[PDB]
Design a protein around this ligand. Structure first.
Ligand SMILES: *[C@@H]1O[C@H](CO)[C@@H](O[C@@H]2O[C@H](CO)[C@@H](O)[C@H](O)[C@H]2NC(C)=O)[C@H](O)[C@H]1NC(C)=O
Ligand SMILES: *[C@@H]1O[C@H](CO)[C@@H](O[C@@H]2O[C@H](CO)[C@@H](O)[C@H](O)[C@H]2NC(C)=O)[C@H](O)[C@H]1NC(C)=O
Ligand SMILES: *[C@@H]1O[C@H](CO)[C@@H](O[C@@H]2O[C@H](CO)[C@@H](O)[C@H](O)[C@H]2NC(C)=O)[C@H](O)[C@H]1NC(C)=O
Ligand SMILES: *[C@@H]1O[C@H](CO)[C@@H](O[C@@H]2O[C@H](CO)[C@@H](O)[C@H](O)[C@H]2NC(C)=O)[C@H](O)[C@H]1NC(C)=O
Ligand SMILES: *[C@@H]1O[C@H](CO)[C@@H](O[C@@H]2O[C@H](CO)[C@@H](O)[C@H](O)[C@H]2NC(C)=O)[C@H](O)[C@H]1NC(C)=O
Ligand SMILES: *[C@@H]1O[C@H](CO)[C@@H](O[C@@H]2O[C@H](CO)[C@@H](O)[C@H](O)[C@H]2NC(C)=O)[C@H](O)[C@H]1NC(C)=O
Ligand SMILES: *[C@@H]1O[C@H](CO)[C@@H](O[C@@H]2O[C@H](CO)[C@@H](O)[C@H](O)[C@H]2NC(C)=O)[C@H](O)[C@H]1NC(C)=O
Ligand SMILES: *[C@@H]1O[C@H](CO)[C@@H](O[C@@H]2O[C@H](CO)[C@@H](O)[C@H](O)[C@H]2NC(C)=O)[C@H](O)[C@H]1NC(C)=O
Ligand SMILES: *[C@@H]1O[C@H](CO)[C@@H](O[C@@H]2O[C@H](CO)[C@@H](O)[C@H](O)[C@H]2NC(C)=O)[C@H](O)[C@H]1NC(C)=O
Ligand SMILES: *[C@@H]1O[C@H](CO)[C@@H](O[C@@H]2O[C@H](CO)[C@@H](O)[C@H](O)[C@H]2NC(C)=O)[C@H](O)[C@H]1NC(C)=O
Ligand SMILES: *C1O[C@H](CO)[C@@H](O)[C@H](O)[C@H]1NC(C)=O
Ligand SMILES: *[C@@H]1O[C@H](CO)[C@@H](O)[C@H](O)[C@H]1NC(C)=O
Ligand SMILES: *[C@@H]1O[C@H](CO)[C@@H](O)[C@H](O)[C@H]1NC(C)=O
Ligand SMILES: *[C@@H]1O[C@H](CO)[C@@H](O)[C@H](O)[C@H]1NC(C)=O
Ligand SMILES: *[C@@H]1O[C@H](CO)[C@@H](O)[C@H](O)[C@H]1NC(C)=O
Ligand SMILES: *[C@H]1O[C@H](CO)[C@@H](O)[C@H](O)[C@H]1NC(C)=O
Lengths: 203, 420, 86, 50, 50
């Protein structure tokens, strides 16, 4: 039952076809449900009335079948458009849309043929084994507020580092990975640390 | 009159003129999307025949029409529950907000659930719920997820997005101060973190005012929930028309079956009952066909709502106008009687000023291009500023990069690239 | 229940994931006997939010998940004339 | 006024002359008994899928 | 019985009382001739749109 969605479509189509076939055995008010016997045991006048009843019943059944097939075809077309969009954005590229190509951070996708559909294998990145750290929006050094260029200020209790937001890679607070914006009075929650300057030890 | 499309505005375009915003507005806007309709079950035999054996025996000649109608209606009914599951059950673990709500000045009181409230909804949720307004074999099946349970999904999603940001959308929820989450969302739209941190109080006040204005608009203005009320009215009208069709004789002597049985012999009564049966069956088939079409429309709406919940609430979307008008910052879900209301918090630049802009700067016979900003000029001096906010900075080697000599570039100007 | 009268299943205080949906938040599942329960929406996870605390991942997982999407159904043709009349 | 239902007693108050009652879809929902002039009420006999 | 079809020598085994055979969806698919009493698989002759 892993491929439940495809089996559902197959079962719906088979059930609709079987119902349409079984509707041929209904009388619809006629003396007999088989046309050959009606033509065999009736004169053209009365046989005409019986055949008219059979015709109206079978035509109504066929109209119902075609209407439900059209609705199911619209649903299948919506599904196929979604599948084409997922092929374009998940397989032919890397998607930033959340949950569009799997639960997690999308990395890539692989298509696989199915008897009446497509199976997408979404390879995604899921963070795990998180740890709690102390954190500050900025760092006040020499009366200047330093903000991380692309990371996060974190603290294990005694030292402050810059780490990328989705993986713990602590790094020394430096001018290379931070930028200065004004004094440290305006920002709320700023802490004090020394922003190591690479140039000074070389000089 | 002949309608006017809009105010004729000619942009002051020039080949060396740019407009940089100097301020912003935090705008929260509501988007209402239906997710489900009432699950209605129509027993074909009771509707067409009531409680007559002769009518049932005559209807048997038509075959599996009634069973097909019932299976289609059951499919619609289960599809409604599937739609609700897809829209709201997008969260693993029911997250809860901390007892102490220190969110950097942002006030989610109107959006968070209220214990004194009957269904533990939010204030806005009762607003939305208050705005909106068994016979002949008709039954209404209750939805699988009751209003309290959908409200609890909404509370879980809201608490997760407030506390952990978008992290809970990918994997386990990772706590982060709301100020820093808002700063990262600012980085998403191309605005640096210092803009948020230096303007944190102003942005919190703007968000609070926008939420209060949404509250006032919902409380005072009626017909805001037009789509949900339209769906409810359409379903009620369809059911009422189905009931009313039982009062039509369809060419028979009477529209009531027992009278035809009582005052006629079974031969002619058979023909009259056949006329009534075919008329009522046609009416029921029309009802089921229109319910299938409306269910397809509602399923499309619920798919769109689930996509918006995934890409606007569980994350930050770069798709234009997908999660509100402006630069999307974040979104909040709210349970609606038969849909969902997304409060989109977006960034809208404001108070723009015009400046003389240059593609590059020729210094020492070299062309310098901004790393992430734009070369603007107030009339006499040149600066690098970020595109979406006016923060002028001195032309330096750290914020610019060199590529070739300064003769190829069209529109290049002369300035000094200060070397720290 | 709000859905109706359920006979043959025993009510239990405990909440589990839904197995057979009865309705109005009530489901039924087989566990010797058939039990009926209000479904469990999920675990209660109160995230340790603080104004100066963050949670940084220290490891990751590469997860590959399957999504099945129908793209076509059987192309069927029903000749109206010979179906109705042979 | 022929029908099939459960004749519960209600408090609708029908005006001296009005005898029958109806609803939005015109279905007899109340009827006063000719004797004792009591408002009464009508509800359908219980039905539903199993 | 009456119809149009080819009559193949059937490999099916009718019980003595049984006379004809209907397949799924109630379509006659086998008949036993009276005089010689052997099973005949009826297959409708080929048809299709052009
Ligand atoms: C927080 O991290 C810092 C940086 O690693 C730790 O400080 C160093 O700890 C190591 C232990 O292996 C010592 O050898 C160094 O001398 C420490 N100082 C440095 C590198 O400057 C600190 O101990 C950590 N604190 C906690 C509570 O784990
Ligand atoms: C973050 O939250 C902490 C804890 O609520 C705040 O710490 C309080 O600070 C005030 C003044 O600095 C003290 O009077 C309180 O006693 C502190 N509370 C506790 C529990 O120690 C802090 O002010 C908040 N804001 C930050 C850190 O920017
Ligand atoms: C970070 O360092 C600065 C400067 O060393 C501290 O500023 C001091 O603030 C107190 C109280 O306002 C004043 O009495 C001192 O005179 C300030 N120092 C100077 C040099 O002006 C600031 O308090 C520190 N931050 C924290 C959180 O301790
Ligand atoms: C968040 O907003 C709500 C409602 O706007 C505030 O609740 C009101 O608080 C004031 C006191 O400041 C009371 O006089 C009102 O009765 C409260 N209710 C309403 C409906 O106005 C709530 O205080 C705000 N949160 C914070 C932290 O200020
Ligand atoms: C940016 O726009 C905001 C509007 O929200 C300005 O904030 C208001 O400024 C007026 C003064 O013109 C004050 O009377 C209001 O009280 C302010 N509102 C809030 C919520 O702070 C803000 O001053 C503008 N910034 C600049 C630089 O012009
Ligand atoms: C354009 O900006 C420049 C840079 O700020 C302005 O030049 C400075 O103006 C200040 C006035 O507060 C003087 O103190 C500086 O000496 C000026 N020169 C510098 C900083 O190099 C200039 O006035 C601005 N022009 C206009 C029209 O706004
Ligand atoms: C941008 O447009 C302006 C205005 O047309 C151009 O300035 C002209 O430049 C030519 C050649 O340098 C002069 O002969 C004209 O007199 C200028 N016109 C004006 C109104 O100043 C400019 O060349 C265009 N391209 C840029 C700035 O790169
Ligand atoms: C920018 O500055 C350079 C350097 O001063 C200018 O280059 C001069 O251009 C004139 C006209 O072609 C020549 O006669 C000089 O010999 C050039 N000097 C050098 C050092 O190459 C350039 O014209 C300036 N551009 C603008 C737009 O003012
Ligand atoms: C990150 O998680 C992976 C598992 O996904 C760890 O790899 C396993 O580590 C254990 C040690 O506890 C070994 O016994 C297994 O054989 C490893 N499996 C594989 C496939 O390598 C990995 O050590 C973790 N890394 C960190 C830094 O915690
Ligand atoms: C129709 O006749 C009945 C039978 O008498 C009337 O019911 C009586 O009403 C009086 C009025 O209080 C009671 O005291 C009697 O006990 C009732 N009869 C019985 C058998 O209980 C009824 O009022 C008449 N309807 C009218 C006059 O409209
Ligand atoms: C902006 O355009 C106006 C009107 O054309 C002009 O007067 C003004 O000088 C321009 N400002 C700058 C800084 O170029
Ligand atoms: C830091 O705090 C959390 C709070 O629940 C606790 O689990 C643990 O000590 C740290 N973080 C994690 C998730 O390891
Ligand atoms: C500079 O640009 C135009 C030029 O006409 C004018 O609207 C005004 O002077 C300034 N506009 C802005 C964006 O403030
Ligand atoms: C829990 O189950 C027990 C055992 O039947 C029952 O007595 C009780 O009413 C139930 N509910 C609570 C809240 O204890
Ligand atoms: C009757 O059937 C037998 C066996 O099938 C056959 O031999 C015989 O000829 C049949 N009778 C006639 C009159 O042909
Ligand atoms: C994480 O929080 C837990 C629980 O409050 C605390 O015991 C631990 O010291 C914290 N760790 C850091 C590095 O903040």
């Amino acid at each position: 039952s892993a491929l439940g969605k495809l089996q559902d479509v197959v079962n719906q189509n088979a059930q609709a076809l079987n119902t349409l076939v079984k509707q041929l055995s209904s009388n619809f008010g006629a003396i007999s449900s088989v046309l050959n016997d009606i033509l065999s045991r009736l004169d053209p006048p009365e046989a005409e009335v019986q055949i008219d009843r059979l015709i109206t019943g079978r035509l109504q059944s066929l109209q119902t079948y075609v209407t439900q097939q059209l609705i199911r075809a619209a649903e299948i077309r919506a599904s196929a458009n979604l599948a084409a969009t997922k092929m374009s954005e998940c397989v032919l590229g890397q998607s930033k849309r959340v949950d569009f190509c799997g639960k997690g951070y999308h990395l890539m996708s692989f298509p696989q043929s199915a008897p009446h559909g497509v199976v997408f294998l979404h390879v995604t990145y899921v963070p795990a084994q998180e740890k709690n750290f102390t954190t500050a929006p900025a760092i006040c050094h020499d009366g200047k507020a330093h903000f991380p260029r692309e990371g996060v200020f974190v603290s294990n209790g005694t030292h402050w580092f810059v780490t990328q937001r989705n993986f713990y890679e602590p790094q020394i607070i430096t001018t290379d990975n931070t930028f200065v914006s004004g004094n440290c009075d305006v920002v709320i929650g700023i802490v004090n640390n020394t922003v190591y300057d690479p140039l000074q030890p070389e000089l | 009159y002949t309608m006017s499309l809009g105010a004729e505005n000619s942009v002051a375009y020039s080949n060396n003129s740019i407009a940089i915003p100097t301020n912003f507005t935090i705008s929260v806007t509501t988007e209402i999307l239906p997710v489900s309709m009432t699950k209605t079950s129509v027993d074909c035999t009771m509707y067409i025949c009531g409680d007559s054996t002769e009518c049932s025996n005559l209807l048997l000649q038509y075959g599996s029409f009634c069973t097909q109608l019932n299976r289609a209606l059951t499919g619609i009914a289960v599809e409604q529950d599937k739609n609700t599951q897809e829209v709201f059950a997008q969260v693993k673990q029911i997250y809860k907000t901390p007892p102490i709500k220190d969110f950097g000045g942002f006030n989610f009181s109107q959006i968070l659930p209220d214990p004194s409230k009957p269904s533990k909804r939010s204030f806005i949720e009762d607003l939305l719920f208050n705005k909106v307004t068994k016979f002949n074999g008709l039954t209404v099946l209750p939805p699988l997820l009751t209003d309290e349970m959908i409200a609890q999904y909404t509370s879980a999603l809201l608490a997760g997005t407030i506390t952990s940001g978008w992290t809970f959308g990918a994997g386990a929820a990772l706590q982060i101060p709301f100020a820093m989450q808002m700063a990262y969302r600012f980085n998403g739209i191309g605005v640096t973190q210092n803009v948020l941190y230096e303007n944190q109080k102003l942005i919190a006040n703007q968000f609070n005012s926008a939420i209060g204005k949404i509250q006032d608009s919902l409380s005072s203005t009626a017909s805001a929930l037009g789509k949900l009320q339209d769906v409810v009215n359409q379903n009620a009208q369809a059911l009422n028309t189905l009931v009313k069709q039982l009062s039509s004789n369809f060419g028979a002597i009477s529209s009531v079956l027992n009278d035809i049985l009582s005052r006629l012999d079974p031969p002619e009564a058979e023909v009259q009952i056949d006329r009534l049966i075919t008329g009522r069956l046609q009416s029921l088939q029309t009802y089921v066909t229109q319910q299938l079409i409306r269910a397809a429309e509602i399923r499309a709406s619920a798919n769109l709502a689930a996509t918006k919940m995934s890409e606007c609430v569980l994350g930050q979307s770069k798709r234009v106008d997908f999660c509100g008008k402006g630069y999307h910052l974040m979104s909040f879900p709210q349970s609606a009687p038969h849909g969902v209301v997304f409060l989109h918090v977006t960034y809208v630049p404001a108070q723009e000023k015009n400046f003389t802009t240059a593609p590059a700067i020729c210094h020492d016979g070299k062309a310098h291009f901004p790393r992430e900003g734009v070369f603007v000029s107030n009339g006499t001096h040149w600066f690098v500023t970020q595109r979406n906010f006016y923060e002028p900075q001195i032309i330096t080697t750290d914020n610019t990069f060199v590529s070739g000599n300064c003769d190829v570039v069209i529109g290049i100007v002369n300035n000094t690239v200060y070397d720290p | 229940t709000r859905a109706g009268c359920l006979i043959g299943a025993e009510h239990v205080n405990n909440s589990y994931e839904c197995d057979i949906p009865i309705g109005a938040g009530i489901c039924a599942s087989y566990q010797q006997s058939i039990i009926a329960y209000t479904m469990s929406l999920g675990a209660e996870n109160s995230v340790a939010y603080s104004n100066n605390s963050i949670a940084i991942p220290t490891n990751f997982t590469i997860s590959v998940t399957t999504e099945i999407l129908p793209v076509s159904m059987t192309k069927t043709s029903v000749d109206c004339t010979m179906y109705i009349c042979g | 006024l022929t029908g099939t239902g459960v004749l519960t007693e209600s408090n609708k108050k029908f005006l001296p002359f009005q005898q029958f009652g109806r609803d939005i879809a015109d279905t007899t929902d109340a009827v006063r008994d000719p004797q004792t002039l009591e408002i009464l009420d009508i509800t359908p006999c219980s039905f539903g899928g199993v």
